[PDB]
Design a binder for this molecule. Structure first.
Ligand SMILES: Cc1nnc2n1-c1sccc1C(c1ccccc1)=NC2
Length: 127
């Protein structure tokens, strides 16, 4: 079995910013989800080999996880908040696409997504 390369977290060619919205996404959004009891499956890329999910990367073509998002935020990979918000939404969507309704992992994603939505609702205006 084989995992794909992880998503990109470093690209010197890509223009970068450190904006107050992106700071909020790290300090509030990421940190809130990261510390949650259901965070652990989402803290690194899905290891399809160890988890014995040989069809995972057949179905999921835009993988994303909070480990990757954490690296992107801490290493200032983004230009804007929308990019990062999209990464979170990709992460949740992948979970719902791959798994069955009511599965434990789906319930975990739903709990994290509820908090995500609560925090993004108060994304500060640009300074
Ligand atoms: C993320 C993600 N998206 N789909 C899956 N996962 C992961 S990544 C580590 C375990 C799981 C699990 C899982 C299953 C039951 C309880 C906790 C995690 N299911 C497969």
């Amino acid at each position: 079995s084989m995992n794909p390369p992880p998503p990109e977290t470093s690209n010197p060619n890509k223009p970068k910013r450190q904006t107050n919205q992106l700071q909020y996404l790290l300090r509030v959004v990421l940190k809130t989800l990261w510390k949650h009891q259901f965070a652990w499956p989402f803290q690194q890329p899905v290891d399809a080999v160890k988890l014995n999910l040989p069809d995972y990367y057949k179905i999921i073509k835009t993988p994303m996880d909070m480990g990757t998002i954490k690296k992107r935020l801490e290493n200032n990979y983004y230009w804007n908040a929308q990019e990062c918000i999209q990464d979170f939404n990709t992460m949740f969507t992948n979970c719902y696409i791959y798994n069955k309704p009511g599965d434990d992992i789906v319930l975990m994603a739903e709990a994290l997504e509820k908090l995500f939505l609560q925090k993004i609702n108060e994304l500060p205006t640009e300074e």
